[PDB]
Amino acid sequence: LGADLTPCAENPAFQALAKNARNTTADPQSGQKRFERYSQALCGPEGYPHLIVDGRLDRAGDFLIPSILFLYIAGWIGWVGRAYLQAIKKDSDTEQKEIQLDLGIALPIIATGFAWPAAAVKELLSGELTAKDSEITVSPR
Amino acid sequence: TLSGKTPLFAGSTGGLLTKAVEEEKYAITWTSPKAQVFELPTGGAATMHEGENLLYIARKEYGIALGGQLRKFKITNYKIYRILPSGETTFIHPADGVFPEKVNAGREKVRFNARSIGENPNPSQVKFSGKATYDA
Amino acid sequence: DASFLSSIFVPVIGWVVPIATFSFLFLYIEREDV
Amino acid sequence: VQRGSKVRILRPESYWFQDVGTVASVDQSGIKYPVIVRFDKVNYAGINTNNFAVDELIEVE
Amino acid sequence: ADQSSYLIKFISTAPVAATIWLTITAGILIEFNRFFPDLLFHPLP
Amino acid sequence: SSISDTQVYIALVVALIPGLLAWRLATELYK
Amino acid sequence: KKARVIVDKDPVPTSFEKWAQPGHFDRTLARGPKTTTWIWNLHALAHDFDTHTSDLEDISRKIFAAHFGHLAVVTIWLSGMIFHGAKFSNYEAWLSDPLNVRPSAQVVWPIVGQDILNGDVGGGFHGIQITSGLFQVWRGWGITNSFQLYCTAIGGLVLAGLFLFAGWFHYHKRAPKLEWFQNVESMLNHHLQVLLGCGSLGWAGHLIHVSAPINKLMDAGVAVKDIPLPHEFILNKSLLIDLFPGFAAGLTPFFTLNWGQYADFLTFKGGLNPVTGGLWMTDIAHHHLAIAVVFIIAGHQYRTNWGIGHSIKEILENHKGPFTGEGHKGLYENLTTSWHAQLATNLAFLGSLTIIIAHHMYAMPPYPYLATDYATQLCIFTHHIWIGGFLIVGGAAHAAIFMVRDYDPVVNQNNVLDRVIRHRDAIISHLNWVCIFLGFHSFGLYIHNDTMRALGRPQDMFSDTAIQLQPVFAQWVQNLHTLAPGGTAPNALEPVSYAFGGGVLAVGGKVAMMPIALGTADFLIHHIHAFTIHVTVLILLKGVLFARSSRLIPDKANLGFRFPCDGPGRGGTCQVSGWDHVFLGLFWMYNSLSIVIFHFSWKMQSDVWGTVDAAGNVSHITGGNFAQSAITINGWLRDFLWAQASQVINSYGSALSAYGLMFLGAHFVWAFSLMFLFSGRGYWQELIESIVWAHNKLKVAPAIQPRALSITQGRAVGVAHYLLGGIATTWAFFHAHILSVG
Amino acid sequence: QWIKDPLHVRPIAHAIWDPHFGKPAIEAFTQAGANGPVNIAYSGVYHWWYTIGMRTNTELYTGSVFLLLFASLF
Amino acid sequence: SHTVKIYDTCIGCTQCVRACPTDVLEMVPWDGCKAAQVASSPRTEDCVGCKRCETACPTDFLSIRVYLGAETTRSMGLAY
Ligand code: CLA
Ligand code: CLA
Ligand code: CLA
Numbered sequence A: 001l002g003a004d005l006t007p008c009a010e011n012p013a014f015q016a017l018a019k020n021a022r023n024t025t026a027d028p029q030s031g032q033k034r035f036e037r038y039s040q041a042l043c044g045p046e047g048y049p050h051l052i053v054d055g056r057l058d059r060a061g062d063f064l065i066p067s068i069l070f071l072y073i074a075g076w077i078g079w080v081g082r083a084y085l086q087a088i089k090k091d092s093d094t095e096q097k098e099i100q101l102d103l104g105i106a107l108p109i110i111a112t113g114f115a116w117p118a119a120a121v122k123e124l125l126s127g128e129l130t131a132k133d134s135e136i137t138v139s140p141r
Numbered sequence B: 001t002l003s004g005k006t007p008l009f010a011g012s013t014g015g016l017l018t019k020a021v022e023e024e025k026y027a028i029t030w031t032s033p034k035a036q037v038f039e040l041p042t043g044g045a046a047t048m049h050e051g052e053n054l055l056y057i058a059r060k061e062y063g064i065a066l067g068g069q070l071r072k073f074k075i076t077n078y079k080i081y082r083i084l085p086s087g088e089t090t091f092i093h094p095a096d097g098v099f100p101e102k103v104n105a106g107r108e109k110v111r112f113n114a115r116s117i118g119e120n121p122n123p124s125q126v127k128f129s130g131k132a133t134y135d136a
Numbered sequence C: 001d002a003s004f005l006s007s008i009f010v011p012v013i014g015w016v017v018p019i020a021t022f023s024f025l026f027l028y029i030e031r032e033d034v
Numbered sequence D: 001v002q003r004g005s006k007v008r009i010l011r012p013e014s015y016w017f018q019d020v021g022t023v024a025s026v027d028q029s030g031i032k033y034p035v036i037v038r039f040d041k042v043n044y045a046g047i048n049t050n051n052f053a054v055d056e057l058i059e060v061e
Numbered sequence E: 001a002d003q004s005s006y007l008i009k010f011i012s013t014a015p016v017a018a019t020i021w022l023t024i025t026a027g028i029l030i031e032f033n034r035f036f037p038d039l040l041f042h043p044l045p
Numbered sequence F: 001s002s003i004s005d006t007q008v009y010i011a012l013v014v015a016l017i018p019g020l021l022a023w024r025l026a027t028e029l030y031k
Numbered sequence G: 001k002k003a004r005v006i007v008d009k010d011p012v013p014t015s016f017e018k019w020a021q022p023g024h025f026d027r028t029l030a031r032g033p034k035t036t037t038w039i040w041n042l043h044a045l046a047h048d049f050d051t052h053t054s055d056l057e058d059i060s061r062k063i064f065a066a067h068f069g070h071l072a073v074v075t076i077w078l079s080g081m082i083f084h085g086a087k088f089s090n091y092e093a094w095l096s097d098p099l100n101v102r103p104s105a106q107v108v109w110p111i112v113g114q115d116i117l118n119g120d121v122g123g124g125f126h127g128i129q130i131t132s133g134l135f136q137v138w139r140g141w142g143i144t145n146s147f148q149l150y151c152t153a154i155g156g157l158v159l160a161g162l163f164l165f166a167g168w169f170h171y172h173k174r175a176p177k178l179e180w181f182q183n184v185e186s187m188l189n190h191h192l193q194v195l196l197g198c199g200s201l202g203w204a205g206h207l208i209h210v211s212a213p214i215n216k217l218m219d220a221g222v223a224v225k226d227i228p229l230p231h232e233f234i235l236n237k238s239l240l241i242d243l244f245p246g247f248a249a250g251l252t253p254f255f256t257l258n259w260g261q262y263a264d265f266l267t268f269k270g271g272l273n274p275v276t277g278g279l280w281m282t283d284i285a286h287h288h289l290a291i292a293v294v295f296i297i298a299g300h301q302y303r304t305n306w307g308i309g310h311s312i313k314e315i316l317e318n319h320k321g322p323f324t325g326e327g328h329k330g331l332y333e334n335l336t337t338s339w340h341a342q343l344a345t346n347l348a349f350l351g352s353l354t355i356i357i358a359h360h361m362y363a364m365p366p367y368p369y370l371a372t373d374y375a376t377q378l379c380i381f382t383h384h385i386w387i388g389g390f391l392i393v394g395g396a397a398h399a400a401i402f403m404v405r406d407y408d409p410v411v412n413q414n415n416v417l418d419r420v421i422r423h424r425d426a427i428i429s430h431l432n433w434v435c436i437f438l439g440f441h442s443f444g445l446y447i448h449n450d451t452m453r454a455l456g457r458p459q460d461m462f463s464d465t466a467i468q469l470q471p472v473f474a475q476w477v478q479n480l481h482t483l484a485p486g487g488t489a490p491n492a493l494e495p496v497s498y499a500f501g502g503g504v505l506a507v508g509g510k511v512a513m514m515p516i517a518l519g520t521a522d523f524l525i526h527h528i529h530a531f532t533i534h535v536t537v538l539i540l541l542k543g544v545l546f547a548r549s550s551r552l553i554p555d556k557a558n559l560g561f562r563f564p565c566d567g568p569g570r571g572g573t574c575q576v577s578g579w580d581h582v583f584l585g586l587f588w589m590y591n592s593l594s595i596v597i598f599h600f601s602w603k604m605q606s607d608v609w610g611t612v613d614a615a616g617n618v619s620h621i622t623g624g625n626f627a628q629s630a631i632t633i634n635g636w637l638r639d640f641l642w643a644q645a646s647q648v649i650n651s652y653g654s655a656l657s658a659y660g661l662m663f664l665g666a667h668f669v670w671a672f673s674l675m676f677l678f679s680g681r682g683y684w685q686e687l688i689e690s691i692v693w694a695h696n697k698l699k700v701a702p703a704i705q706p707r708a709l710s711i712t713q714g715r716a717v718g719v720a721h722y723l724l725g726g727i728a729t730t731w732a733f734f735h736a737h738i739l740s741v742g
Numbered sequence H: 001q002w003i004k005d006p007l008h009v010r011p012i013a014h015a016i017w018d019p020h021f022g023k024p025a026i027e028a029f030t031q032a033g034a035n036g037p038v039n040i041a042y043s044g045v046y047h048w049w050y051t052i053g054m055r056t057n058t059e060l061y062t063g064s065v066f067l068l069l070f071a072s073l074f
Numbered sequence I: 001s002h003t004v005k006i007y008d009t010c011i012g013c014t015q016c017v018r019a020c021p022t023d024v025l026e027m028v029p030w031d032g033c034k035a036a037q038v039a040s041s042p043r044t045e046d047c048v049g050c051k052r053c054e055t056a057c058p059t060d061f062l063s064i065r066v067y068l069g070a071e072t073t074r075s076m077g078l079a080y
C-alpha cells in the first residue's frame, strides 16, 4: 500500500536478506523456511515485511486471525477468574480461598470456560453481568 | 521554686540550648521508690534518685515521653512545668490534677462540633468571609 | 562606539543590583515595622 | 432496624457508603448514633465496625 | 495419607500454583516455537 | 555597521520612562 | 561455667501442616488476609525471628538451622558451577592454550534465534564467555581433566545434602540449648583453629603436593596428558624430587628445625610468575603454612573447660581510660544477648574485608593467567566491591536494629556506647562539616576544571600541566614498597606487587601488571572516594546514633526500627527511622562504589593494561588519556561513558547482543524506580479506588481488598529497582566493553 | 549583512562581554563576521523581521523605542 | 497553632488522649455516647500536628481532625 510496499518475492532487498538467513531453531533450514513463509507479505524498501492492519481479508492473517485468537483466550481467562471469584463468595472464608485455590471449584470452572461468549451474552441479556450504581460504593463528591 | 535532685548522668550534648534562657523552659518532677536507671529523652542513661527528682528539659514532648516511660517503672506522680525567662513557673501537666485519660468534672468541651464531618460546608460558601469550613 | 557601555552595565547587573537588592530584601524581611 | 438485619449505609463520608452491612446491636439510650453495624470489608484503618443512626440506614431484604 | 492433603493444600497456594501454571504455559509456548518457529503472521491460502 | 552612540544614549534616556513608571506600578500593587 | 554439649530432643515435629498455613509464624498474619498488605507482610516478616518468638533460645535454634540451609544453597551453586565446567565447557581446550582460548561454560539452547549468543570462544567450542574466573581457580587447584571436575561436583552435591540434613536435624531432632550458643570463647577457639588454621594447613598440604607440582609441569611446557595424575606424586616420590629437590630430605628437617632445605617449595619470591602472571605457588603454599600456624596459635587464646585462656568479658572490663568512663563494660552482654549486634559487626567487617580482597586480587593476581585475562580481572574486582558495599550497609542496618530492639540502658551505662550516644551532636555535626569540606575540595575542583577548560583557560586548571596536586604521600609509600626487597625485606626478591614499582611484567605480549603511577587525577579521584565514603558514613552513623531518639522525636524507639514517619507535623517528619537512613545510605553506597569501579576501569585501561612490543614499549587500551581527561566531568562523560559504551550499543547482531539488551533493560528498570521513589501511596490508593469501582460494577471483586503499597514498601521497591537498574547497566557496559577490547 | 544572504550568514543574538573568557574562547565566539565574541540567534527573529518588511538597523531601532513607549503606556 | 476539632461521632474510647505526645487532648463529661465522654482539645498551642490522634481513632472517618495552621516554636517542635 503506502510508502513503497512491494510483495516480498519481487523485492531485491528481501531476496538479499534471504541468502544470509540465520537459523532460528536447531534444524539447518529454519532461515530458509522463514523467508519462504514471509515471501507472501508486503515488503518495505529495506527488505522487512510490513503488516497491514486496516481490516481487509487479503491481509487477514496479519492482524485479524491473531485478534480473534487472542480475544478468545483472554475472554476465557478473565471469564474463568470472574466465575471463580463469584463461586467462592458464598463460602464465608473467601479471603483464604484466594491465596489458596480450591482445585475442586476451579477445575470445573476452567473446564467450562470454552463457552464464555455464550455465557457472557446470556449474562448480559439477563442483567447479571453488572451491578447497580446505587449498590456499589463511591466517594463523596 | 521547684524542689528536686538532678538525676545522675555525666552530661550530654543533647540537652537544652539557648531557647531555654531566651524563650521558654520545661521541668519534670517525680518521686521514686528506689534509685534506678532510666533513659533520657535527649539520649543516654541516667539514674533517678530515691525521693524527689527534677530534670529540666527543652520541650514539653520530652516530658510526656519521659512520663510515659516512668509508667513502666510504676511511677504515676509526675508533674510537668513550663518556665519562662522571667522565672514564671506554670503547672501544665497534669493541669487538672487528674490525668487527661480519666474524665474529671469541671472540664468543659473545647472545639466540639455538633455535627459529623461530612456535614461541614463547602469552601466556596465560606469564601472571602474570614472563616474556615470547619469553624463552629 | 558605545561598546564601552557593556563594561559598565554588566558589572552593575552582576554585582551592584544583587548587593543592593539583597541588602534591601534582607533588611526588609528582618524588619519588624511592616 | 433490627439486630441481624442487613442494612445499607447512607453516610457519604463512610468507607462503606452504599454497601451492605449487618446490624450487631442497637442502643436504646437515646444517643445519636446507636446502631452498631459490622461489615465483611475492612476500611483503610483495618476496622469493620461503625456506629450509625437510623436515618443513615435502609433495610436490605 | 493426611500429609498428602497438606501437600495438596501447599500446591494450591498462590505462588506454587502460579509457578506450576506459568511453567506449563511457558513450556507450551517454548515447545511450539521450537517445532514451529518464526510465525510473524498467520499464513493464508 | 550598527546604530550610533546617540541612538543608544537616547534609548537609555527613553528607557528611564518605563523604569519610573514600573517603580510606581510595583509600589502601587504593593500599597 | 563450662562449655558442654546440651541439646533438647525432638522440640518441633516434622509435619507439612504449617506449609498449608501461610503466615503461621506471626499472631497477626495467622488470622489470614483481609487486604493485599498481608501478602507483602508475609514476606517482610518471614525471617524476622524476633517477631516470631520472644525467647532467645528458639530464635538461636532457627538461626542455626537456617544457616545450614543457606550453606546448602551455596554448595548447590558451587557444585553447579563446577558441573558446568565439567560438562558444558571448553576447560580442557583452555588448558592447552590459556592465552588464545576464551573461557566459556553455558551453551545456550537454540530456540528463538538466541544461538547467536553461542559465540566462537575457541577450542572448537561455542558458548557464552564467562568472566568469573572459575577456569583460573581450577587450574590453580591443579585440575587437569573433566573427571576431576565431575568428582568435585558430586562431592559438592553430597556436601549440600549433608548441610540440608544437618539443618533439619538441628531444628527438629537435636536442638541445642541457649547456653550452647553463648560459649563464644569456645566458638572462637574452634573457628580460628579448625576452620581457619586447619583449613589453611590442609590447603597448604594441597598446594605443596598437588598444585605446585602440576602447575610447575604446566609452566615447564609439558602437555596436560603427559602430566601425571596428582596421586602419583604421593606414590612415586621421585617425581616430586625431580621437581622440588627439597623433598629428598624428608620430614626430618621439619622437626629438627632445619627449615632451609624446604626453600625449594616454600619461598619468599614476591612479584609474579613470568609465565602465567600469577603468584608463585611456592609463595602461596608458604603463605598458607605461615597463616595456618598463626591461626592455630591464635585460637588458643580464649578460656574453655581447662582454666587457661582468657575471659573476653575480663579483657573488655579492663580497657577503660580517662576519656571513656567505664570502657567496654557492657559490650560483652550486647554481643552475647543480641544476634543483631553480632550481625552488625560480622557484616560490616566482612564487607570491609571483601573490599580489601578486591584491591589485593587485582594488584597481586593470585591465579595463573588471571592478570592477562582483563575481563575476569575487571569483573571480579567490581563484583567484590559491590558485595563489600552491600554488606557494610547491612551492618549499619543491624546496628540500628540493635539500638531500637536489643539495647538496654542498664547494661550500657557510662561505657563507650552510652557515651557516644551522649555527644552524637558533636560527632554528626563534625561529620557534616567533613562531608561539606570534602565535597567542595573534591568535586568543586572538577567544576573549576570544567569551567576553566570551557573558557579556553587550560593553564588555570588542576592538572599535571597547570596547578599541580601531587598525591605525595601515596607516591612516598609506593617508593618505600619498591625499595623494600633491598633492605626492609631482605629475603624478598621482587616487590609485593608491581603496582607500586619494579618494572613491567608481560605475559603473552600483554601487561600482567605494571607500576600504577599517581598524578593529579589520582589525587582528585581519591578525594572523591573519601567524600562519598564519608557521606555514606554520615547517613548510616546518623541512622544508628539517632535510632532511638532525637531532638525532633523523643520516643522514636517506641515507633520502631521501620516506620514511615511521625506524620506531617512538627514541620514534617518523613524518613526519621533507622530503616530510612539505611534506605538513603543505599543510594550513597551505590554512588560511591560506582565512582570506585569507574576509577578502576579507566585507570587500569589507560595506565596499566595493554600490549607490549618486542622493543618493550607499552601501548595501553585507551592510550594514556586518564591524565588529562579524567580531571573534568566532561572528560568522564566523553572519554569514558560515551567512548567506551560504543561496544554495548553496536552489539546487536553479534554474540554480545544480550549485553546490549541488558543495557537497555537495566535503563528501563532504573527509570521505573523513579515512579516509586518520587511518588507516594495516597495517589495510588485513590487510583485503586476507581479501579475497584470498575470491578464492583462488573462483579469481579476480590475479597482480599486491593491496597496500595505501604510508604516503607514504596521506598524499598524504589531503591531496589534503583540499585538493580543502575548496577546492571554498569554490568552490561563493563562486560561488552572489556569482552571486546580486553 | 544578513539581508543580502539569508542562507549563508549566521544571525547574531547579541554581543558577549564576559571577563572569564580566555583568549581561545574569545577567538571561538568571534563568529558570523563580528568584531568580537557574539552569540548566534536561533529564535528566527531575523526571518520574521525580514519577511514583514524590515531592512535596516534604524527600523529595528525605531521598533524598539516604540515598544519602550508602548510599555510605558501600559 | 494547629486546630484540633472533635466531631459528634465520638464514642469516647479515650485512644486519642493516650496517643497524643504533647497533651493536647482530654476527656470531658458528655451524654451523646454510651461511654458518656468526648475528647476535647484545650491545649492546641502544644499541638505539633503529628496526627497520632487521627491514627488512633476507631470511628469510620475520624471523630477528631487536626487542621494544620500557622507555625510556632511549639508547633514546629524546635528545641532551639
Ligand atoms: C479475574 C481476573 C481479572 C479480571 C476479569 C479483571 C478485569 C478487569 N480489570 Mg483487572 N486486575 C486483576 C485481575 C482481573 N481483572 C489483577 C489480579 C490485577 C492486579 C495486577 C488487576 C489490575 C487491574 C488494573 C490496574 C486495571 C484493571 C482493569 C480491569 C478491567 C478492564 C480489563 C483490563 O484492563 O484487563 C487487564 C488487566 C490486567 C493486565 C491485570 C492483570 C490481569 C491478570 C494477569 C489476570 C488474572 C488471572 C486470574 C488470577 C486467574 C484466576 C483463575 C481462577 C480460576 C483461579 C476489567 C474489569 C482496568 C480498569 O479499571 O478498566 C476499567 C485497570 O485500570 N485491572
Ligand atoms: C547475612 C546477611 C543478612 C541477614 C541475615 C539479614 C537478616 C535480616 N534483615 Mg537484613 N540486610 C542485609 C543483610 C542481611 N540481613 C543487607 C546486606 C542490607 C542492606 C541492603 C540489609 C538491610 C536490612 C533492612 C533495612 C532491614 C533488614 C531486615 C532483616 C530481618 C528480616 C529479613 C526478612 O524478613 O527477609 C525479607 C526478605 C525479602 C522480602 C526479600 C527482599 C528481596 C530483595 C530486596 C530483592 C533482591 C533482588 C535480587 C538480589 C536480584 C533480583 C532478582 C529478581 C529478578 C528475582 C532479618 C533479621 C529488616 C528487619 O526487620 O530487621 C529486623 C529490615 O527492615 N535488613
Ligand atoms: C548531583 C546531584 C546532587 C548534588 C549536587 C548533591 C549535593 C549534596 N548532597 Mg545529595 N543527594 C542526591 C544528589 C545530589 N546531592 C540524591 C540523588 C540523593 C537521594 C538519595 C541525595 C541525598 C543526600 C543525603 C541523604 C545527603 C546528601 C548530602 C549532600 C551534600 C554533600 C556535602 C556537601 O556540601 O557537598 C559539597 C557541595 C557540593 C559538592 C555541591 C556542589 C558545589 C559547587 C561545585 C560549588 C558551588 C558553586 C557556586 C560557588 C555557586 C554559584 C551560585 C551563583 C548563583 C552565584 C550536598 C549539598 C549530605 C549532606 O547534606 O551532608 C552534609 C547528606 O547527608 N545528599
Ligand SMILES: CCCCCCCCCCCCCCCC(=O)OC[C@H](COP(=O)(O)OC[C@@H](O)CO)OC(=O)CCCCCCCCCCCCCCC
Pocket: G319, G320, G321, G322, G323, G324, G325, G327, G328, G416
Ligand atoms: C571511626 C573512624 C575514625 C574517624 C575519626 C577521625 C576524626 C575524628 C577525630 C576524633 C575526635 C575524638 C575521638 C574520640 C575522643 C576520645 O575518646 O579520645 C580518647 C581516646 C582514648 O580514650 P581512652 O584513653 O579512654 O582509652 C580508653 C579505651 O579503652 C576506650 O575506652 O583517644 C583516641 O581515641 C584518639 C584517637 C583519634 C582517632 C583517630 C585514629 C584513627 C585510627 C587510624 C588507624 C587506621 C589505620 C591507619 C594506617 C596508616
Ligand code: SF4
Pocket: G564, G565, G566, G567, G568, G569, G572, G573, G574, G575, G680, G711
Ligand atoms: S504521610 Fe507520607 S509525606 Fe506525609 S508525613 Fe507521612 S511519610 Fe511523610
Ligand code: SF4
Pocket: G569, I004, I019, I020, I021, I022, I023, I024, I025, I046, I047, I048, I049, I050, I051, I052, I053, I054, I066
Ligand atoms: S496532632 Fe499530635 S499533638 Fe495534636 S492532638 Fe493529634 S496527637 Fe496530639
